[PDB]
Amino acid sequence: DKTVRWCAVSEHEATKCQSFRDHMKSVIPSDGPSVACVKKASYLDCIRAIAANEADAVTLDAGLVYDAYLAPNNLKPVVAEFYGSKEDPQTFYYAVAVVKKDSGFQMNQLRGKKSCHTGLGRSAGWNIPIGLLYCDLPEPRKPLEKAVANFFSGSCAPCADGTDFPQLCQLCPGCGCSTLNQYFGYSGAFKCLKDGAGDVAFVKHSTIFENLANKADRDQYELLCLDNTRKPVDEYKDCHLAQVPSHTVVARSMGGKEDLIWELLNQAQEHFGKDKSKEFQLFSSPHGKDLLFKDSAHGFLKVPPRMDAKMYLGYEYVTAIRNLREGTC
Ligand SMILES: [Fe+3]
């Protein structure tokens, strides 16, 4: 029992949150946990709000989980999403680079092309691909935003500072950090490619399948593999940039209500998980894709006691993030 203040980013998430609140009220008893919705403009405002005791929980992509851990925020991961199936849950996913068929360029020929990113600092959309191109970037590589802006001939990198790095919002003027920007996130980054604004979209292996139902529409796209070849989109297991940890819900280190968070989500998945209810779905919405949780998730797993972001993310991934930040070639 008691209320978990979920931090919703912008209108669409706010709408799904309110429906989430209402549906749980109808199934949960008076003595069960409940949801209240707190709307903010960006994930970064949700991170501050939780630290300031204005909200309690928010789901973040793993690259943002690192940032949330840093002082003075010190949030910790408490519940993880899992993908795949309930039968063989995967606590990771694949970062891929999607391009259109016959566009004629490999991964070593990206300079001067136009890029669509899910958002600044996110695993698949940013950390992995920029991490892989880092030394191909021209000096000076600090700040990163500027070297990236000079390598591609225009991008959409949501959450980046368009005032300071205008080329980063060339494909999505303003670099809006929420679903109000139609090119934000996995599906937004894919739309940026499909619409012809960009030449490459840095997304996850499931993105295209979530967006194109026909195999014949999907045959018009391919993946860039690290060996400078291209493969079809079904072949992501042998043509991907990296494997990355799942998105996770974070909470405060003190008075964080981690117990209630797990309690609420565990019940939520039981009533409203994949194919559970005709009334409401935790992992999909008529209002948008990946709102509050990713549409590709199948459920949740509780993170082990007192695990910090660094341990959760793993040495490798943490090393990569660090090396992007200072990083020496
Ligand atoms: Fe992600």
CATH number, domain with residue 177: 3.40.190.10
50 and 185 Cβ atoms separated by less than 8 Å: no
Q: What is the residue type of 40?
A: K
Local structure of 49: helix, strand or coil: helix
190 close to 208: Cβ distance less than 8 angstroms = yes
What's the CA gap between 96 and 203, in Å, rounded? 6
| C-beta of residue 43 within 8 angstroms of C-beta of residue 60 | yes
Judgement on whether residues 186 and 143 belong to the same structural domain of the protein: yes
The candidate with the shortest Cα–Cα distance to 324, out of 158, 177, 133, is: 133
Could you tell me the distance, in angstroms and rounded to a whole number, from the CA of residue 4 to the centre of ligand 1? 24
Question: Is 70 in contact with 39 (CB distance < 8 Å)?
Answer: no
CA of 310 to the centre of ligand 1 (A): 17
DSSP state of 87: S
**61 has binding-site annotation:** yes
- Compute CA distances 106 → 98, 199, 219, whole Å: 11, 11, 18
Residues 101 and 138 in one domain: yes
- Inside any domain, residue 37: yes
Give residue 54's identity as a one-letter amino acid code: E
Q: How many domains does the chain have?
A: 2
Question: Is 141 marked as binding a ligand?
Answer: no
Range(s) of the domain holding residue 279: 1-82+248-309
Sign of CA dihedral 244, 248, 252, 255: negative
Please tell me the distance between residue 246's alpha carbon and the centre of ligand 1 in angstroms.
Answer: 7
60 has which bridge partners? 248
CA 32–ligand 1 middle distance (angstroms): 31
Is residue 320 a part of any domain in this protein? no
Domain co-membership, 5 together with 63: yes
Contact partners, residue 163, CB within 8 Å, separation at least 6: none
Is 247 labeled as ligand-binding? yes
Ligand 1 centre to CA of 28 (Å) is 30
CA distances from 241 to 11, 96, 130, 321 (A): 33, 6, 11, 15
- Enumerate long-range contacts of 300-303, CB under 8 Å, 24 or more apart: 300/79, 300/80, 300/81, 300/82, 300/249, 300/265, 300/266, 300/269, 301/79, 301/80, 301/82, 301/89, 301/91, 302/78, 302/79, 302/80, 302/262, 302/266, 303/77, 303/78, 303/79, 303/80, 303/248
Do 169 and 87 lie in one domain? The reply is: yes
Q: Max alpha carbon distance in the chain (Å)?
A: 60
Residue 325 belongs to some domain of the structure: no
Say what angle helices 43-51 and 62-69 make with each other, to 10 degrees: 40
Residues 94 and 239 in one domain: yes
Kind and range of the H or E run holding 132: helix 128-133
41 is annotated as contributing to ligand binding:
no
CA of 63 to the centre of ligand 1 (A): 8
Residues with CB under 5 A from ligand 1 (ion): 61, 123
The answer on 113 and 160 residing in a single domain is yes
Cα 136 to its chain centre, rounded Å, is 25
Distance 94 CA to ligand 1 centre (A): 9
Same domain, 18 and 131: no
**What resolution, expressed in A, was reported for this entry?**
1.6
Residue 136 sits in the same domain as residue 5:
no
Residues 197 and 99 in one domain: yes
Q: Is 93 annotated as a binding residue?
A: yes
C-alpha closest to that of 15 among 318, 317, 328, 288: 288
Nearest in space to 113 (alpha carbons), one of 126, 124, 103, 121: 103
Count each helix (H run) and each strand (E run) in the chain, helices first: 11, 13
Q: How far is CA 54 from the centre of its chain?
A: 23
- Residue 310 phi/psi, 5° resolution? -65, -45
Ligand 1 centroid distance, CA of 214 (Å): 24
Tally the residues of the chain: 329
> Got the DSSP string for 225-265?
ETTTEEE-GGGGGGS-SEEEEPPEEEE-SSS--HHHHHHHH
Task: Say how many Å lie between the CA of residue 328 and the centre of ligand 1.
Answer: 25
